[PDB]
PDB file of C-alpha atoms in Angstrom:
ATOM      1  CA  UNK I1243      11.861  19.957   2.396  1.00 15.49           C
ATOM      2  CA  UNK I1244      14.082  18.897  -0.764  1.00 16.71           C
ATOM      3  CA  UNK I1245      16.840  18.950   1.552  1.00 15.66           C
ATOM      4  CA  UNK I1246      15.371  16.581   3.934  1.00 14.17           C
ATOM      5  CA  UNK I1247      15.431  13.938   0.885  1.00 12.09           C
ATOM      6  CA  UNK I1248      18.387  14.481  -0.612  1.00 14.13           C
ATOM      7  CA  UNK I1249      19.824  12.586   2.846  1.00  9.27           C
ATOM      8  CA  UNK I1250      17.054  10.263   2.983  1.00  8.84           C
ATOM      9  CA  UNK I1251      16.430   8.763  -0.245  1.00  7.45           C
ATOM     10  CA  UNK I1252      14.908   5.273   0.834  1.00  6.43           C
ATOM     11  CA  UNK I1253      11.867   7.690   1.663  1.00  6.15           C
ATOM     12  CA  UNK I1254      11.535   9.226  -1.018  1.00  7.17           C
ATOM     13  CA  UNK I1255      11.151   6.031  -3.469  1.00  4.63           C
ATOM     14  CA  UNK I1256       8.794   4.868  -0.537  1.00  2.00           C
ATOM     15  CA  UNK I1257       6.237   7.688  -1.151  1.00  2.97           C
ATOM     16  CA  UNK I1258       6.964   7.121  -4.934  1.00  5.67           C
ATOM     17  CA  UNK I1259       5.740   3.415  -4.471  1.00  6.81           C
ATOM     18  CA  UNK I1260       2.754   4.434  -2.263  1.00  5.55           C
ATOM     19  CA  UNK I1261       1.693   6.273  -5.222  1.00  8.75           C
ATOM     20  CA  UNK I1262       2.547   4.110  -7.642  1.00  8.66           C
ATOM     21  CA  UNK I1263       0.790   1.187  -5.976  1.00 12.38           C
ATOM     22  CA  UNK I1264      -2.435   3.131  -5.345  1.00 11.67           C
ATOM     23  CA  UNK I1265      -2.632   4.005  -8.823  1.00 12.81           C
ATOM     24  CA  UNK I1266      -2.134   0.632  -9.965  1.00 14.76           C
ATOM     25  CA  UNK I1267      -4.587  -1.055  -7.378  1.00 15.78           C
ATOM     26  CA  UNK I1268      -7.079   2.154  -8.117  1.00 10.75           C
ATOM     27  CA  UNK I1269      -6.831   2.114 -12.504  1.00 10.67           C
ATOM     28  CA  UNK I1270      -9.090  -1.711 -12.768  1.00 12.10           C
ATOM     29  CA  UNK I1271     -11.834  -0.008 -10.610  1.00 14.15           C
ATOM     30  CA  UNK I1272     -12.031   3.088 -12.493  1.00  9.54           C
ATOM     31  CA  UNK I1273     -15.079   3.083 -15.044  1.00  9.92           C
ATOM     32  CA  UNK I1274     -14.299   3.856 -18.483  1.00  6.97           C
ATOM     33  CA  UNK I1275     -16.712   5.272 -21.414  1.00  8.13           C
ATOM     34  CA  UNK I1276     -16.241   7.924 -24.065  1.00  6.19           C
ATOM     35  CA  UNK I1277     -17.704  10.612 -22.073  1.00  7.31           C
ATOM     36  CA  UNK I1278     -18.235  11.693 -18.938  1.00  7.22           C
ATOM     37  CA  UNK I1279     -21.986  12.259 -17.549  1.00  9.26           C
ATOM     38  CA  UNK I1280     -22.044  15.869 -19.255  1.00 10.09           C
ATOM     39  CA  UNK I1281     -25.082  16.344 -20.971  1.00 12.13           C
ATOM     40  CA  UNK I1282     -27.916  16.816 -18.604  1.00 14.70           C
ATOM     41  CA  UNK I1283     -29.756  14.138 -17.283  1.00 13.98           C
ATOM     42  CA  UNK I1284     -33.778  13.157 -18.488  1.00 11.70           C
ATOM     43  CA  UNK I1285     -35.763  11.991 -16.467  1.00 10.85           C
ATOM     44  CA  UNK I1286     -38.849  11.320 -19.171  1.00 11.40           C
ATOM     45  CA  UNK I1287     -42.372  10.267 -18.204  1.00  8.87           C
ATOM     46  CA  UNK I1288     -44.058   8.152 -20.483  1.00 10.70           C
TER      47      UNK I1288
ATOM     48  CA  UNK X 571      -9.510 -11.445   0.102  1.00 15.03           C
ATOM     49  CA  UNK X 572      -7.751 -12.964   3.102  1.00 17.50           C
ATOM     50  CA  UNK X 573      -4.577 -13.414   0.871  1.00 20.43           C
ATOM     51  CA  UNK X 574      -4.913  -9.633  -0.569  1.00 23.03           C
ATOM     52  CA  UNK X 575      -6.159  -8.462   3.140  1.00 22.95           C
ATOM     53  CA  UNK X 576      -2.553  -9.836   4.352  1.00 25.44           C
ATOM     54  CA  UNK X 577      -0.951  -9.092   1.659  1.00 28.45           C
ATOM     55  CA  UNK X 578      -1.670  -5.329   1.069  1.00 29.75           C
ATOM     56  CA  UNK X 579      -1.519  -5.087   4.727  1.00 31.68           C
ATOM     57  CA  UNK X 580       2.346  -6.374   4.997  1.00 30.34           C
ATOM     58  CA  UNK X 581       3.222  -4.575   2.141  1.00 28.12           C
ATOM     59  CA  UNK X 582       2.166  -1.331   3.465  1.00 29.37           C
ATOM     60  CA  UNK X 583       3.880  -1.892   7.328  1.00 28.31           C
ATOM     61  CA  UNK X 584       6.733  -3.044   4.925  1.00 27.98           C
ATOM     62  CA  UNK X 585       6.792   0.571   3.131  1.00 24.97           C
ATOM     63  CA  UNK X 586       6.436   2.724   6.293  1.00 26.02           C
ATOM     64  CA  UNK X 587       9.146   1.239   8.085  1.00 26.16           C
ATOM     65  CA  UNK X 588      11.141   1.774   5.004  1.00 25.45           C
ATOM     66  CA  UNK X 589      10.068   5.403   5.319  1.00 25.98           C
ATOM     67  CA  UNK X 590      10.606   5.601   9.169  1.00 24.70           C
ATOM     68  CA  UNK X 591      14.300   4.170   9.135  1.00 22.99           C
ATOM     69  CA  UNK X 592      15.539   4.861   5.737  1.00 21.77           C
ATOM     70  CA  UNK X 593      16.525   1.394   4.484  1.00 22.57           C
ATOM     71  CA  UNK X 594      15.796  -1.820   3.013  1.00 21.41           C
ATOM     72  CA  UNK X 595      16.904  -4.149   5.455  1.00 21.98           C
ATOM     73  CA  UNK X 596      15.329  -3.042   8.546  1.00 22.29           C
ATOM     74  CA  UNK X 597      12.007  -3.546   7.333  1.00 22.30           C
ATOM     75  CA  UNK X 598      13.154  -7.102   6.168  1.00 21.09           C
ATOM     76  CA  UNK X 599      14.161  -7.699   9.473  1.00 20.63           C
ATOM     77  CA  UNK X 600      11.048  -6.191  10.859  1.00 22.12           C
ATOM     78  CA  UNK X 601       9.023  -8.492   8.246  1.00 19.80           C
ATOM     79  CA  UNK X 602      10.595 -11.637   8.960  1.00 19.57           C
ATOM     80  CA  UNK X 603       9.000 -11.794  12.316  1.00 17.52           C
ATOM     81  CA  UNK X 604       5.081 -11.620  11.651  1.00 18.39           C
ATOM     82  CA  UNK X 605       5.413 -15.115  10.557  1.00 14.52           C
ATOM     83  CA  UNK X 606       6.695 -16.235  14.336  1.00 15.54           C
ATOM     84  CA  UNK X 607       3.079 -14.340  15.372  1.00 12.92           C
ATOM     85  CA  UNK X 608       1.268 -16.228  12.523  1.00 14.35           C
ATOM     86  CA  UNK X 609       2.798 -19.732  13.620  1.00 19.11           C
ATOM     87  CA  UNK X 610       1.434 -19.363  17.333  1.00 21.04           C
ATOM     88  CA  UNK X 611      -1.561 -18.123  16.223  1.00 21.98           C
ATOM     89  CA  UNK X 612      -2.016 -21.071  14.412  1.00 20.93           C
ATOM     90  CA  UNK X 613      -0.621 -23.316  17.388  1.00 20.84           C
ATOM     91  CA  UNK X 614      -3.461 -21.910  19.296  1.00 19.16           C
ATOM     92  CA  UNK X 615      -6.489 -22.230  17.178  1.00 20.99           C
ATOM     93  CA  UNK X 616      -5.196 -25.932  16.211  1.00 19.18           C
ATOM     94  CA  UNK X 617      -4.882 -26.881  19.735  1.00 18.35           C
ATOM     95  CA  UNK X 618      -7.861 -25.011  20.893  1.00 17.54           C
TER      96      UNK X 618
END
């Protein structure tokens, strides 16, 4: 596998961009809040 | 999203061929001819 790269560098900074591009177009879309939803959910009946 | 649509699209033909022939310049060249498609495209559906 490494070996493969070390000849064919051009893909390796193109997977390396895939990710990085991903990631950038994926972080605005990703909720943010101080916790996750880990305490149980209520469901309460008034 | 027609600009993002096209321009996530050519950006990711752009990476693969980068992948599939291990250069910078090939996918350039491979780039440089989507607008020739584009401009009959538009030559059609201006005509039409």
């Amino acid at each position: 596998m490494s070996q493969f790269f070390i000849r064919r560098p051009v893909f390796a900074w193109v997977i390396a961009i895939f990710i990085i591009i991903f990631g950038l177009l994926s972080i605005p879309k990703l909720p943010i809040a101080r916790f996750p939803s880990v305490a149980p959910p209520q469901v309460n009946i008034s | 999203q027609m600009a993002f649509l096209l321009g996530l699209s050519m950006l990711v033909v752009f990476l693969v061929l980068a992948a599939l022939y291990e250069s910078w310049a090939i996918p350039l060249s491979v780039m440089l001819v989507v607008p020739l498609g584009i401009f009959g495209a538009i030559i059609a559906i201006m005509s039409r």
